């Protein structure tokens with residue numbers, strides 16, 4: 001996601017933490033964000049451009065084979081030079097395992113728990129963005145130029161940001177905090193309140209990232225790439241039909257992030 005999807009995913013997650021998770025998250029954050037995880041959940045998108053964090057660039061996404069519409073960890077979760085685990089599913093495992101040493105303490109200089117928290121929180125968002133688990137040759141739709149209503153865009157960006165920005169504008173006066181409340185509403189009492197226990201039961205961490213990534217490639221095929229031709233204009237049709245899919249993935253990432261953090265920081 002771009003900034004808004006991450007902010008919403010992290011705020012949903014922060015509001016669902018248990019007491020030990022809430023406290024750990026508070027101890028790990030810098031004072032300037034006043035306890036707000038969502039104010040830093042974009043940080044991995046900032047530092048992926050830094051020379052010292054070049055290793056992080058492949059960790060935001062998964063390249064799956066063109067037109068195959070499936071994910072397999074061994075085949076797909078590796079960077080462009082074949083180094084294993086270097087994808088968003090591998091990263092979620094890595095930082096979850098790192099945070100599980102926080103309770104007992106670590107005598108390793110190099111494990112930074114603030115960064116583990118921010119990477120984990122961000123990547124839990126990314127694995128839920130369907131076009132972050134799209135085809136290899138089009139870079140998850142980044143190479144598919146198009147137009148979104150009047151202005152120029154690309155298919156990846158439509159899912160990272162445009163659908164969210166158009167929904168916020170048309171129904172919430174550009175107000176993301178209120179959009180987020182309706183998402184929160186839709187799983188506390190609304191249409192997703194039925195599915196909640198389901199979202200939370202995905203096995204161990206490998207099992208959950210496999211599940212999340214599979215859901216994402218399947219949405220990328222069924223809803224993302226579906227109907228789209230390069231150079232053309234997408235508008236009310238694509239926007240109205242895809243919006244609810246985008247909203248659910250925001251919600252799902254948040255809910256599942258909270259579950260992970262509750263497990264790693266809890267008993």
Ligand SMILES: *[C@@H]1O[C@H](CO)[C@@H](O[C@@H]2O[C@H](CO)[C@@H](O[C@@H]3O[C@H](CO[C@H]4O[C@H](CO)[C@@H](O)[C@H](O)[C@@H]4O)[C@@H](O)[C@H](O)[C@@H]3O)[C@H](O)[C@H]2NC(C)=O)[C@H](O)[C@H]1NC(C)=O
Nearest residue numbers: 028029030031032033040043109111112113114115116118
């Ligand atoms: C573990 O990793 C953490 C993240 O990589 C490290 O935390 C980072 O530590 C640096 C200090 O080395 C902080 O940078 C400082 O930020 C403060 C506050 O900045 C904010 O406010 C100013 C306005 O005054 C604004 O301009 C900034 O953009 C911020 O909004 C500055 O006053 C300092 O000059 C300095 O730049 C980072 O904030 C901090 N990042 C995070 C995400 O916490 C941490 O040190 C590492 N821990 C260990 C033990 O190595």
Ligand SMILES: *[C@@H]1O[C@H](CO)[C@@H](O[C@@H]2O[C@H](CO)[C@@H](O[C@@H]3O[C@H](CO)[C@@H](O)[C@H](O)[C@@H]3O)[C@H](O)[C@H]2NC(C)=O)[C@H](O)[C@H]1NC(C)=O
Nearest residue numbers: 055056059084085086087090091092094095098110111112
């Ligand atoms: C799991 O998280 C750790 C960070 O806690 C990642 O460790 C980092 O792995 C990268 C990529 O292999 C290492 O890059 C190397 O940096 C050294 C500098 O000492 C340099 O010799 C090389 O140029 C190379 O780029 C990086 O040092 C290393 N950092 C730490 C703190 O261990 C790891 O990649 C993560 N894995 C996944 C799947 O998320």
Ligand SMILES: *[C@@H]1O[C@H](CO)[C@@H](O[C@@H]2O[C@H](CO)[C@@H](O[C@@H]3O[C@H](CO)[C@@H](O)[C@H](O)[C@@H]3O)[C@H](O)[C@H]2NC(C)=O)[C@H](O)[C@H]1NC(C)=O
Nearest residue numbers: 171179180181182183184185186190191240243244247248
């Ligand atoms: C949370 O879920 C509810 C359903 O329980 C969503 O309500 C639906 O919202 C869409 C647009 O967001 C409505 O479509 C709009 O309807 C008007 C007609 O009044 C039309 O002119 C607009 O162009 C647009 O198509 C839809 O009717 C509505 N469905 C129901 C049953 O009320 C809500 O959007 C969800 N929001 C979030 C943020 O999760």
Ligand SMILES: [Cl-]
Nearest residue numbers: 030043046047
């Ligand atoms: Cl920083």
Ligand SMILES: [Zn+2]
Nearest residue numbers: 001002125126
């Ligand atoms: Zn993102």
Ligand SMILES: [Zn+2]
Nearest residue numbers: 001002156160
């Ligand atoms: Zn993206």
Ligand SMILES: [Zn+2]
Nearest residue numbers: 001045060126
């Ligand atoms: Zn990202």
